[PDB]
Amino acid sequence: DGEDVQALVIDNGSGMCKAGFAGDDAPRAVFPSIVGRPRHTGKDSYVGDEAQSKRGILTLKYPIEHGIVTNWDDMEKIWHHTFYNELRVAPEEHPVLLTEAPLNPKANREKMTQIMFETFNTPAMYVAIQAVLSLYASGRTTGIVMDSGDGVSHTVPIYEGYALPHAILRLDLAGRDLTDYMMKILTERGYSFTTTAEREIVRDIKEKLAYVALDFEAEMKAYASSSALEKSYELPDGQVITIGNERFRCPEALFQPSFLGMESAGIHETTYNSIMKCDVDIRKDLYGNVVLSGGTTMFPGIADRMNKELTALAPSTMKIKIIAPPERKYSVWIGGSILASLSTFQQMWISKHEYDESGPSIVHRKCF
Amino acid sequence: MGSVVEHPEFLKAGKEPGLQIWRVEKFDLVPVPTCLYGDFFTGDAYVILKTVQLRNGNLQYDLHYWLGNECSQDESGAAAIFTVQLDDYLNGRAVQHREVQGFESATFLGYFKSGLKYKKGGVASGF
Numbered sequence: 055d056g057e058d059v060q061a062l063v064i065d066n067g068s069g070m071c072k073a074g075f076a077g078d079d080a081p082r083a084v085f086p087s088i089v090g091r092p093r094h095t096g097k098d099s100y101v102g103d104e105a106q107s108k109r110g111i112l113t114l115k116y117p118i119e120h121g122i123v124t125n126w127d128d129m130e131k132i133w134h135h136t137f138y139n140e141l142r143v144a145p146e147e148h149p150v151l152l153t154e155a156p157l158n159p160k161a162n163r164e165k166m167t168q169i170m171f172e173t174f175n176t177p178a179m180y181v182a183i184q185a186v187l188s189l190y191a192s193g194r195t196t197g198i199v200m201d202s203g204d205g206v207s208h209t210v211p212i213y214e215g216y217a218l219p220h221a222i223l224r225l226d227l228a229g230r231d232l233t234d235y236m237m238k239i240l241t242e243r244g245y246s247f248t249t250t251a252e253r254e255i256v257r258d259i260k261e262k263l264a265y266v267a268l269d270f271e272a273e274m275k276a277y278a279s280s281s282a283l284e285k286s287y288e289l290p291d292g293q294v295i296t297i298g299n300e301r302f303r304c305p306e307a308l309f310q311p312s313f314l315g316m317e318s319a320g321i322h323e324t325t326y327n328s329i330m331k332c333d334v335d336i337r338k339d340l341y342g343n344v345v346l347s348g349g350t351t352m353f354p355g356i357a358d359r360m361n362k363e364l365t366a367l368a369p370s371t372m373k374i375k376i377i378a379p380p381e382r383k384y385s386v387w388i389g390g391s392i393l394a395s396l397s398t399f400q401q402m403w404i405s406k407h408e409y410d411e412s413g414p415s416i417v418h419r420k421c422f
Numbered sequence: 423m424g425s426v427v428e429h430p431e432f433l434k435a436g437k438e439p440g441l442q443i444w445r446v447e448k449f450d451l452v453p454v455p456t457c458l459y460g461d462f463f464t465g466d467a468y469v470i471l472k473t474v475q476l477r478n479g480n481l482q483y484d485l486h487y488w489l490g491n492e493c494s495q496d497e498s499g500a501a502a503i504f505t506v507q508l509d510d511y512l513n514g515r516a517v518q519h520r521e522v523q524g525f526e527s528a529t530f531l532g533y534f535k536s537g538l539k540y541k542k543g544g545v546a547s548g549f
């Protein structure tokens with residue numbers, strides 16, 4: 055796709071990579087962030103859906119864990135696949151915006167930068183924090199983003215365009231944990247979901263039928279008495295199963311991590327704690343601009359439940375607003391697309407010239 | 423190495439006490455004709471800088487990004503980012519404010535002595 059120079063936007067997540075062209079309202083390519091290599095022989099590699107389909111003969115790996123790159127050789131294959139197989143571009147002809155997680159280690163930031171300039175010969179590149187881009191996509195400069203994906207959740211207070219690092223909180227409770235939990239409770243129901251292919255079916259049941267109950271205890275009851283809210287789901291073979299309270303117990307684990315044997319605070323309490331770590335004078339503006347982002351925030355009912363819970367934790371006169379855009383699976387990416395399209399961003403990128411002069415540590419000064 | 427905005431409009435911003443208004447137009451920040459100040463298209467987003475003279479010789483800045491009910495996501499996103507960029511350009515000294523149609527602060531509404539007015543329509547999305 056491509057005004058004058060066409061910038062690219064790539065949002066790399068633990069579970070999914072979202073990539074596309076700056077100026078588009080949505081990522082053109084969305085694929086699983088999985089690299090597969092032969093269990094025996096041909097060097098060779100597969101990415102995304104093709105790796106998944108050849109899983110019996112490949113060793114599959116996820117280069118990103120909890121939002122952070124832990125394998126750079128496999129990350130390079132994601133990126134190569136992104137440029138040549140998905141976007142069909144020559145990376146040397148385009149400025150590239152990449153995203154990162156809140157608090158990404160310093161060395162990781164340098165490596166991404168080095169890889170783009172030395173492996174892919176990008177003419178220019180930039181690295182942005184994912185939560186800050188979602189805040190921008192919602193048309194705000196101040197607020198708190200609760201970003202939840204497949205591997206990590208974060209609460210990220212932002213003020214006048216910038217994250218407040220001391221107040222950011224990380225919770226290793228996210229989509230993958232919920233899929234796994236749904237496998238466990240559907241099993242207890244009487245079914246059997248334990249295998250890899252089964253995990254894929256369950257991931258789809260969670261995405262299609264799960265929801266967050268506004269009142270968890272009154273819901274268990276409505277279900278314990280009546281059958282009216284149970285749902286049918288058709289398996290790939292035509293068998294039809296019935297889902298009952300597993301529908302809301304699954305995402306309930308976001309608010310009650312003990313359901314997963316976890317000692318942590320839930321997403322509502324993590325959001326509160328992040329707010330309370332900020333200066334008292336900006337907290338009203340945080341409560342008033344709670345932005346949800348990421349695929350694990352797409353459960354129906356989640357925004358109403360966050361509103362109820364934060365209302366209970368804050369003073370009764372505090373105005374609370376939870377913003378949950380219908381496009382929030384891709385808010386990160388869209389924010390990056392807007393940022394990279396601005397007439398005034400020309401000046402922001404790291405150019406190849408700047409890289410050649412200062413090396414990878416240039417990122418600490420240009421990308422903040 | 424720096425990241426200094428070179429957009430002609432940043433060079434004009436906040437040079438003297440007064441009101442300055444720009445409209446987001448296809449991912450660019452465009453000056454509004456001064457005879458049209460106070461009439462906002464509800465399908466658009468704008469950035470407003472109010473500069474007040476301080477006893478001190480230096481200038482006080484309040485940046486307000488105004489969001490029409492029908493403005494597109496690229497327009498509200500861009501108005502917010504241009505606000506951050508202008509504030510940064512001004513050495514952080516501006517106080518930023520988000521202004522939503524129908525819910526603007528009294529201070530913002532007070533900038534328009536003949537009363538702000540909404541009109542339907544606007545520039546098309548830059549997406």
Ligand SMILES: Nc1ncnc2c1ncn2[C@@H]1O[C@H](COP(=O)(O)OP(=O)(O)OP(=O)(O)O)[C@@H](O)[C@H]1O
Pocket residue numbers: 066067068069070071120121202203204205206207228229230233257260261262347348349350351352353383
């Ligand atoms: N409609 C849905 N309802 C519930 N969960 C969903 C829905 N759609 C997607 N998800 C889940 O969202 C997760 C992927 O979201 P996302 O792309 O934001 O994550 P990521 O960026 O890959 O991960 P992370 O941000 O943790 O590194 C998966 O767990 C997926 O099952």
Ligand SMILES: [Ca+2]
Pocket residue numbers: 066067068184203348386
């Ligand atoms: Ca993500």
Ligand SMILES: [Ca+2]
Pocket residue numbers: 465466467492493494497543544545546547
């Ligand atoms: Ca418009």
Ligand SMILES: [Ca+2]
Pocket residue numbers: 214509514515516517518
């Ligand atoms: Ca400021």
